[PDB]
Amino acid sequence: GXCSDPRXAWRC
Numbered sequence: 001g002x003c004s005d006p007r008x009a010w011r012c
Contacts, residue, residue: 003012 002008
């Protein structure tokens with residue numbers, strides 16, 4: 001759920 005998290009989304 002990396003692309004689901006706002007801060008992890010930057011790496012997606």
